[PDB]
Design a protein around this ligand. Structure first.
Ligand code: MG
Ligand code: ZN
Ligand code: ZN
Ligand code: ZN
Lengths: 141, 84, 102, 133, 43, 49, 114, 264, 196, 559, 65, 160
RNA sequence: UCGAGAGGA
């Protein structure tokens, strides 16, 4: 229909994209101080608009909640730990015969979920538990 | 052949950690092999503590042979050698 | 004998400085018994502070410099691990050859 | 083994130095004008307001381990509302015929001016601070 | 499994460092750390 | 939930990792080294599509 | 593979009697008791009841390591007053309080209706 | 009534019991709530023999699940520990045997609820081994799901124990415990971003204790002796016996001391 | 570990009574030190507690998607409407003593992942046994029940102490000690020997 | 280099390691499974035979026990299965390979063994579970963490070997380090964060707490210190109770900032005869700091006293903290409401500064500073301007942090914190950097394709105005990813060079030993130094002592 | 892969409350908060056992063997 | 550069001075230039100082650059260690580096040098030249597994 | 035995 295009690495040199599709609305204060400071764009010759920025992250980085609030090397560290977590790797774990296959007894869908999670079935096939965690200074163990 | 005379010697009379540890190890090793004990041990049953207590009363009859860089040596009896 | 006198020269500078007659009797009013105890104490402590012959001093020094190098990690001067590599294998050409004029 | 010092003060300023239950107080002996005192007072146990006239004393008694109180059997030389035990740590020769004495009451500090007590206030671990109505 | 099926491998002036041109084509921070950090990347 | 995309050689599921290469049939200009007789180069890697 | 059985937390081993009593070497009228197979559930009650006896000078317990469940209790008291008598006082007074508690509660429960 | 600790029951049910426990030294309350959770004994599955299992799940998975089902243990005192008795492996005087059999005949999935467990040993007239059922429909706990053509057959031997050995022998769930609602003892230092009163909400327990007077200074000889507790039960034992047997196990715990002291 | 690089093994496991209990009786499934929070700057974990708490109580789902204008102030407004302290803190009582903890504890639900490194599949200790034929040294790897490495890195440390006898032990008796005849005149291993 | 200077050795082990505060310093938490597997050959003697025969009877599948017996003939007696497994009578002169038992010396390890004190002797304390438990204050000399770390443990086989572990390889001996002439280990983390909380004047301890706290100290005199306050309540100060851990005869003097002898802030340190006169205790006082408490005790009292002292401090402080409690929320990183307005408008003032400098450069009116090109000068001005922005914003936040806030407390004692972390989590994370410069143009003349070309603004060159708490925008996140990736490249890159550097140093000077005349030399004999260290004294044998003759006016020196 | 009998944190048997949860949603058209509240899971420790539960067992049954 | 210096009284006080920092090194022709202090001047390169002022001067320069590397990270290591390494480089006579060819060719045995780079070449030339090994070095004895004269092995032990 | 890849500090 013509409402979407496939931009390769070289072609986006010649085009001006945009973060939100409400960057194309008119201008003319009262605001919430906790929200992130967003650079007023000052640009108006747009060609494309981003589908949604969250898509820059891969699958393993899609899992992280609030990576925008988090140290970058921490997200790198997580990305290599999340492929290490135990869980239900396949629904047919019983039928298959493979050399190693640890499986979580009681997987739970995480209470804090990326919206991108929905398309990798993390809530459908998770690999962690909603532990009640208390950061605390207890016995020093 | 040549030796370093007892009268003129210029090495630290105080025994270093390394000779104390070696000497204690030698003593404990031979003590383990049913060797005679030269102190009235106060119920001590460990060759390490046995050797330490022999040393403390200077009942250990061994001599060091500190070798100098020229090939020459200096003998230092355990009596001579001090411990702080 | 000269090398001995040399080897304690700064220690003797400190030593004479602290044991000034006025200071020995005014800043801290030492008595004879206490002064003799102090004099013997220092001899024992110093003679305990001698290098025990047999120490593997080179290996110790190498590790002593090398361990903090592992900790090294982050006015445009060349410093850090690259500077250390320059220093170590006598780089003929240096990334920052500089000079400070007095 | 008797009282080493007694005087009467009026507090000048109460300093809650970022402390929830502790205050820092400065007060000069009203009778002897040239003698002042600086000391840390727990305010939760003994409330100390500004411009309060308080009696102040120091004793040497009235090692051996502590014995918890039993009725008035172990009668204690005080009819006070606040007391402390500390240990002298410095004595300052400020100037001729004037002296200053420092105490650290297990953390809480003290400072005492004036030469009037030619006697007592020895360089001694034993020290009691006693405050009255 | 997914993140294995979305991987690359650059066999070998500054390849490891992340680039302005990687925005949206390669995940910014997901990569092994150590032997091959940034040489091996995920989509 | 299996998404596919793997082969089964000798019974072991196998994945071909996408190899990364510099593109072919493009022109690049490279400033050469300081102690080098030639100042610049422009290289083309020619391979038949 | 390594964990000791859970039953060691409340079951005495071979020739491990319940309490071992040792006189404190340094202090006077002082004793250390190595309760076996018990912990803060029980020991804290004993110590806190020792504090109430006004002729009891010292009462304190400590757990060497939470792996094991053997905690020491040490006592000191007035002259001519073996701490075991203060300990007996404490335990028996505790028991009286607990029985009174249970009976009062039963009365309230039977008063209650639901 | 009787001199000592005074208890006022506020609200009551077989599942929940909330009361005020007056005039008790705090250490007693911690220790009682501690032993209320653990040392109090109760019967639950400790052994399982799985004959035929065609389920999706693994047997040890099902055996774990079986352990945590709550079985009636009101008369557990009449029963004895296996470890104590003299039988070869187990007997009717210490162990109660249960049998579980299910087969998938329906096109739809056949469940395996708690009620389908059956009791095989000689009861000998004790209130022992009944799988507790609080589910409104009556089915109770759900152990496994079975397709058409799947069967599961096993035998479970329940034994006496306590929560200190394993958490299935735990008669209580979560016990509320809070004292000095207004922090009048200064027994917790509030973390306040602006105003401690506005940021932290008052608990219901503040309703009963008198509000503080700021003009009055900190009372220092006051100590904690009034507590607000709420005990919950899994149904294995009614709440009243949970707390009563907690007290009784605590006083037995103490009594062994007296005997052992005598032996010295 | 969690989803934010907060790795770490278990130090000790406590029964529920030993655990510090909140007023409602809830007991932490897990306890971690607060000292890993500042140095690593993992505020995402630290916010996940709040979002997961409000989603657990409210009965919805936590929206932790990146580049969303969701704010801690609003999340905490909802949490306050659920009767808890807005920034996640909770009054906590010590389990051993029942005396209230002076510092109210940041406590709530935080998704955690079980990692693939379990000790007993890494535990290994060896006294004697298998040796390579070529080197007459223990075969490499615990899978083959082999011995560990006394590296040149370790040899340096032993050198630095001057511990010559321990060092001889490690490099001969405790690994591949051997006795060989030699002829002095050639000064080599030419010699032929029959010892019986 | 791999089969001759670094052989694979027997009598070795390896585990996930954990830290245990009720373990003392030279103890190690070897598990039974390892202890049953490892052995020591011990020759039978009259002193040992009576225990050793019982051990041989006990067997190898439970502990204590023994797996092997060696005889006059020289042929093994495998005790795992043998008909005479239970009727042994050991003649004198027979070796018995018994399991390692408590208070045995074993050489610990953690690769990479950079320095000599990353491999030191330990006393066995056989414990149940499958982890090498070890003391907390041992993490600094191994650079360990309980996050999946693995540590080896070699076992001696002769009496001289055992001695050398005890006599020169022991942990107390390495408490003072030749390198950086000062202590190695120090109080860390929960103990260090707790000492600060305990020592505060405002912290006052009750009687019931004091008796247990007193008992917990292992070597305790049995003398209950008289309370600080004797009046409305007998109360104890945290300093007073802590003092019991410190032995008699230890004096310490330290002065911080405005430390009058009547200290106002309770800062600095004056400690008399093992009593704490005044000062809050923290890392400067009890860390690995030069001139610290550990530094005093190790040479004044001895190694053994201070090795015991580590455990004693730990046991008191862990208990008090355990019942005081501590935890870090994210209310601990929310700066004051008005302060946030001030912070963001501060950033705005710096933003305007960058704009106006930019326009001035756009008019080609930039005073070209000496040396730098015009574009370089623009760079430096802007980079430093934005760095001012982030540092001033952080210190506007740090100033604005109340005392209850945990993160300050962690920073305050030096347990685990620094200023900049507060800045990046509560003010503004800062400016990213690649190869020194800001985020350069990857796309031709623009950083990202959401920016117009030739844009040198702060937002488009890598500045991250938003804070970790507030949340980074998509472009900020990508720029941050660039910076973090470069940092990780460096991290991976630095180490290998550092390992090679350490290897080259060690192999260059490995022959260097002081001879029996203080002539530092090598195998050739050619002198390197005529007296080691240009004073003939070793490195732990050192202290920062001021010489009062160097400084001062000539009259003041005269007087 | 199946409803856990009890909540790990506290211990209230949530296992008998699963099938009722789904009935609450599908026929009474209730939001999940009120769905768990009807069941009486007052404390969130047990509450997140059912909200965050993924009943994988259905996929496992469908394989005929 | 702010710099403290003796005041006429004798007390030390700051005496700030203007000092120029360059970008290239040609020490040989810069110190001679007038208007400057030609005894104080200092370069960042020890090799040029070695060429001009002498090896003893080059030693202090070498040390000071190692020191600056260390102290720039807010660190400190005792003088003896660094000075011993610096002395090892200087004592050979030139500026012998810590590298495969800078120092490993020497008189220091064969196995000693063959335990670190050019293993087979070190041994090849050693056999070609009939190199003598004292086996006093640690590495030679480590290869041979005997007790190396290290610390405990430095002294022989005999009876009375 | 040999090379290969994937991992943990
Ligand atoms: Mg690690
Ligand atoms: Zn039976
Ligand atoms: Zn021959
Ligand atoms: Zn629950």
């Amino acid at each position: 229909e013509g409402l979407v295009e496939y931009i390769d690495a070289e072609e986006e040199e010649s085009i001006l994209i945009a973060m939100q599709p409400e960057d194309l609305e008119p201008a003319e204060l009262d605001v919430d101080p906790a929200k992130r400071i967003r650079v007023s764009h000052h640009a108006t010759t747009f060609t494309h608009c981003e589908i949604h920025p969250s898509m820059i992250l891969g699958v393993a980085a899609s899992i992280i909640p609030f990576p925008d609030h988090n140290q970058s090397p921490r997200n790198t560290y997580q990305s290599a730990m999340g492929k290490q977590a135990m869980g239900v790797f396949l629904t047919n774990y019983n039928v298959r015969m493979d050399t190693m296959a640890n499986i979580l007894y009681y997987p739970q869908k995480p209470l804090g979920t990326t919206r991108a999670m929905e398309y990798l079935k993390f809530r459908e096939l998770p690999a962690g538990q909603n532990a009640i965690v208390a950061i605390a200074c207890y016995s020093g163990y | 052949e040549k030796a370093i005379p007892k009268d003129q010697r210029a090495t630290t009379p105080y025994m270093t950690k390394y000779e104390r540890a070696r000497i204690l190890g030698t003593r404990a090793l031979q003590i383990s092999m049913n060797a005679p004990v030269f102190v009235d041990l106060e119920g001590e049953t460990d060759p390490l503590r046995i050797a330490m207590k022999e040393l403390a009363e200077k009942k250990i009859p061994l001599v060091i042979r500190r070798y100098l860089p020229d090939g020459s040596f200096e003998d230092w009896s355990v009596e001579e050698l001090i411990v702080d | 004998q000269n090398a001995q006198r040399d080897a304690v020269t700064l220690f003797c500078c400190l030593l004479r400085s602290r044991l000034a007659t006025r200071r020995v009797l005014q800043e801290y009013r030492l008595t004879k018994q206490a002064f003799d105890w102090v004099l013997s104490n220092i001899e024992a402590q110093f003679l305990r502070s001698v290098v025990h012959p047999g120490e593997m001093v080179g290996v110790l020094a190498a590790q002593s410099i090398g361990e903090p190098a592992t900790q090294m990690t982050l006015k445009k001067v060349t410093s850090g691990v690259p500077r250390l590599k320059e220093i170590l294998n006598v780089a003929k050409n240096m990334k920052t050859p500089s000079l400070t004029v007095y | 083994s008797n009282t080493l010092f007694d005087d009467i003060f009026q507090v000048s300023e109460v300093d809650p130095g970022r402390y929830n239950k502790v205050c820092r107080i400065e007060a000069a002996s009203t009778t002897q004008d040239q003698c002042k005192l600086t000391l840390d007072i727990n305010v939760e146990l003994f409330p100390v307001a500004a411009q309060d006239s308080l009696t102040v004393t120091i004793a040497s008694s009235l090692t051996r381990s502590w014995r918890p109180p039993q009725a008035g059997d172990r009668s204690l030389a005080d009819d006070y509302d606040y007391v402390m035990y500390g240990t002298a740590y410095k004595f300052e020769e400020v100037s001729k015929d004037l002296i200053a004495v420092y105490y650290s009451f297990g953390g809480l500090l003290m400072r005492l001016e004036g030469n009037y007590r030619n006697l007592n206030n020895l360089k001694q671990e034993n020290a009691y601070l006693l405050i009255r109505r | 499994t997914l993140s294995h099926l979305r991987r690359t491998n650059t066999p070998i002036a500054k390849p490891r460092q992340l680039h302005n041109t990687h925005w949206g084509l390669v995940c910014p921070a997901e990569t092994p750390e150590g032997q091959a950090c940034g040489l091996v990347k995920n989509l | 939930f299996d998404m596919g995309g793997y082969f089964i050689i000798n019974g072991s599921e196998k994945v071909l990792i996408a190899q990364e290469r510099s593109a072919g049939n493009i022109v690049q200009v490279f400033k050469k080294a300081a102690p080098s007789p030639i100042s610049h180069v422009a290289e083309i890697r020619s391979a038949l599509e | 593979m390594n964990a000791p059985d859970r039953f060691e937390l409340f079951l005495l081993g071979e020739g491990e009697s319940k309490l071992k009593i040792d006189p404190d070497t340094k202090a006077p009228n002082a004793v250390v008791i190595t309760f076996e197979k018990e912990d803060h559930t029980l020991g804290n009650l004993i110590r806190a009841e020792l504090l109430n006896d006004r002729k009891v000078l010292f009462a304190a317990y400590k757990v060497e390591h939470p792996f094991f469940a053997r905690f020491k209790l040490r006592i000191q008291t007035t002259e001519g007053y073996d701490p075991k008598d203060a300990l007996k006082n404490a335990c028996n007074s505790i028991i009286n309080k607990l029985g009174a508690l249970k009976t009062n509660f039963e009365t309230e429960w039977n008063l209650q209706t639901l | 009534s009787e001199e000592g600790p005074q208890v006022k029951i506020r609200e009551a049910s077989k599942d929940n019991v909330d009361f005020i426990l007056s005039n008790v030294d705090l250490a007693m309350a911690n220790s009682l709530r501690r032993v209320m959770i653990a040392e109090i004994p109760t019967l639950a599955i400790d052994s399982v023999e799985v004959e035929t299992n065609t389920t999706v799940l693994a047997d040890e998975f099902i055996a774990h699940r079986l352990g945590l089902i709550p079985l009636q243990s009101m008369d557990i005192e009449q029963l004895e520990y296996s470890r104590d008795c003299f039988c070869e492996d187990h007997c009717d005087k210490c162990s109660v045997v249960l049998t579980l059999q299910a087969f998938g005949e329906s096109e739809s999935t056949t469940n395996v609820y708690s009620k389908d467990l059956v009791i095989v040993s000689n009861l000998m007239g004790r209130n022992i081994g009944h799988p507790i059922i609080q589910d409104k429909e009556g089915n109770g706990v759900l152990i496994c799901k079975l397709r058409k053509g799947q069967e599961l057959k096993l035998t479970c031997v329940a034994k006496k124990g306590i929560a200190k050995e394993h958490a299935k022998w735990g008669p209580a769930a979560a016990i509320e415990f809070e004292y000095d609602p207004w922090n009048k003892l200064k027994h917790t230092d509030y973390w306040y971003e602006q105003d401690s009163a506005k940021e932290w909400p008052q608990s219901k327990n503040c309703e009963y204790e008198d509000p503080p007077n700021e003009g009055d200074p900190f009372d220092y000889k006051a100590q904690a002796d009034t507590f607000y507790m709420n005990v919950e039960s899994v149904g294995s034992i009614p709440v009243d016996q949970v707390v009563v047997r907690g007290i009784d196990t605590l006083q037995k715990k103490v009594a062994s001391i007296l005997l052992a002291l005598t032996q010295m | 570990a969690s989803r934010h690089g907060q790795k770490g093994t278990i130090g000790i496991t406590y029964r529920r009574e030993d655990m510090p209990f909140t007023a409602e009786g809830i007991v932490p499934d897990l306890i971690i030190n607060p000292h890993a929070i500042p140095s690593r700057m993992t505020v995402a974990h630290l916010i996940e507690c709040l979002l997961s708490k409000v989603a657990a109580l409210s009965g919805n789902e936590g929206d932790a998607s990146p580049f969303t204008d969701i704010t801690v102030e609003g999340i905490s407004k909802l949490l306050r409407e659920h009767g808890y302290q807005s920034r996640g803190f909770e009054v906590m009582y010590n389990g051993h003593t029942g005396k209230k903890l002076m510092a109210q504890i940041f406590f709530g639900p935080t998704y955690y992942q079980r990692l693939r490194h379990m000790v007993d599949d890494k535990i290994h200790a060896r006294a004697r046994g298998p040796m390579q034929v070529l080197t007459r040294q223990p075969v490499e790897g615990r899978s083959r029940d082999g011995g560990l490495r006394f590296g040149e890195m370790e040899r340096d440390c032993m050198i630095a102490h001057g511990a010559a006898s321990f060092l001889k032990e490690r490099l001969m008796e405790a690994s591949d000690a051997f006795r060989v005849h030699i002829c002095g005149i050639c000064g080599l291993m030419t010699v032929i020997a029959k010892l019986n | 280099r791999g089969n001759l200077m670094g052989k694979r050795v027997d009598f070795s082990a390896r585990t996930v390691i954990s830290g245990d505060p009720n373990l003392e310093l030279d103890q190690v938490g070897v598990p039974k499974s390892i202890a049953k597997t490892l052995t020591y050959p011990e020759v039978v003697t009259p002193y040992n035979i009576d225990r050793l025969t019982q051990l041989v009877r006990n067997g190898p599948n439970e502990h204590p026990g023994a797996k092997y017996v060696i005889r006059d003939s020289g042929d093994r007696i495998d005790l795992r299965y043998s008909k005479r497994a239970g009727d042994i009578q050991l003649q004198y002169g027979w070796k018995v390979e018994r399991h390692i038992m408590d208070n045995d010396p074993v050489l610990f390890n953690r690769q990479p063994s950079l320095h000599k004190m990353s491999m030191m002797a330990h006393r066995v304390k056989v414990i149940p579970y499958s982890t090498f438990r070890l003391n907390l204050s041992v993490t600094s000399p191994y650079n360990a963490d309980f996050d999946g770390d693995e540590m080896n443990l070699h076992v001696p086989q002769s009496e001289e070997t055992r001695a050398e572990l005890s006599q020169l390889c022991a942990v107390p001996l390495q408490i003072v380090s030749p390198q950086s002439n000062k202590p190695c280990m120090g109080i860390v983390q929960d103990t260090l964060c707790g000492i600060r909380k305990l020592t505060l004047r405002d912290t006052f301890i009750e009687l019931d707490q004091v008796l247990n706290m007193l008992y917990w100290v292992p070597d305790w005199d049995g003398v209950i210190p008289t309370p600080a306050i004797i009046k409305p309540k007998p109360l104890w100060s945290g300093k007073q109770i802590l003092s019991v851990a410190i032995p008699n005869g230890i004096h310490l003097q330290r002065f911080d900032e405005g430390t009058t002898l009547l200290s106002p802030k309770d800062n600095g340190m004056l400690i008399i005869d093992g009593q704490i006169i005044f000062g809050v205790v923290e890392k400067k006082t009890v860390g690995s700091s030069n001139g610290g408490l550990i530094h005093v005790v190790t040479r004044e009292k001895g190694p053994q006293v201070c090795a015991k002292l580590f455990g004693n401090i730990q046991k008191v402080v862990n208990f008090w903290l355990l019942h005081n409690g501590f935890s870090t929320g994210i209310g601990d990183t929310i700066a004051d409401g008005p302060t946030m307005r001030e912070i963001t408008e501060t950033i705005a003032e710096a933003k305007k500064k960058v704009l106006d400098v930019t326009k001035e450069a756009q008019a080609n009116l930039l005073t070209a500073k000496h040396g730098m090109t015009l574009r370089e000068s623009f760079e430096d001005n802007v980079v430093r301007f934005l760095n001012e922005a982030r540092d001033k914003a952080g210190r506007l936040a740090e100033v604005n942090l109340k005392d209850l806030n945990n993160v300050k407390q962690m920073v305050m004692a030096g347990s685990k914190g620094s200023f900049i972390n507060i800045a990046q989590m509560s003010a503004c994370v800062g400016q990213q950097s690649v190869e020194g410069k800001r985020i350069a143009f990857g796309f031709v003349d623009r950083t990202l394709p959401h920016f117009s070309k030739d844009d040198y603004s702060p937002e488009s060159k890598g500045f991250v105005e938003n804070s970790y708490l507030r949340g980074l925008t998509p472009q900020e996140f990508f720029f941050h990813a660039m910076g973090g990736r470069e940092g990780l490249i460096d991290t991976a890159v630095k180490t290998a060079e550092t390992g090679y550097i350490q290897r080259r140093l060690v192999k260059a000077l490995e022959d260097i030993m002081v001879h029996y005349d203080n002539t530092t030399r090598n195998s050739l004999g050619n002198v390197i130094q005529f007296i080691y260290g240009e004073d003939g004294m070793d490195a732990a044998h050192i202290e920062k002592q001021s010489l009062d003759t160097i400084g001062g006016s000539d009259a003041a020196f005269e007087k | 892969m199946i409803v856990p009998v009890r909540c790990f944190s506290c211990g209230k048997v949530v296992g008998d409350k699963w099938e009722s949860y789904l009935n609450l949603l599908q026929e009474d058209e209730l939001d999940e908060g009120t769905a768990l509240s009807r069941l009486g899971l007052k404390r969130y420790c047990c509450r997140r056992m059912i909200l965050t539960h993924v009943d994988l067992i259905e996929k496992f049954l469908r394989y005929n063997p | 550069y702010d710099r403290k210096v003796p005041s006429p009284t004798g007390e030390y006080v700051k005496e700030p001075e203007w000092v120029l920092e360059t970008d290239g090194v040609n020490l040989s022709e810069v110190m001679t230039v007038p208007g400057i202090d030609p005894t104080r001047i200092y370069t960042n390169s020890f090799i040029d100082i070695m060429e001009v002022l002498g090896i003893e001067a080059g030693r202090a320069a070498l040390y000071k650059e190692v020191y600056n590397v260390i102290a720039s990270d807010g660190s400190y290591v005792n003088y003896r260690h660094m000075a011993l390494l610096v002395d090892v480089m200087t004592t050979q006579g030139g500026l012998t580096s810590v590298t495969r060819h800078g120092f490993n060719r020497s008189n220091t045995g064969a196995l000693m040098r063959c335990s670190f780079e050019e293993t087979v070449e070190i041994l090849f030339e050693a056999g070609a030249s009939a190199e003598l090994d004292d086996c006093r070095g640690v590495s030679e004895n480590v290869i041979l597994g005997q007790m190396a004269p290290i610390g405990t092995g430095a002294f022989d032990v005999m009876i009375d």
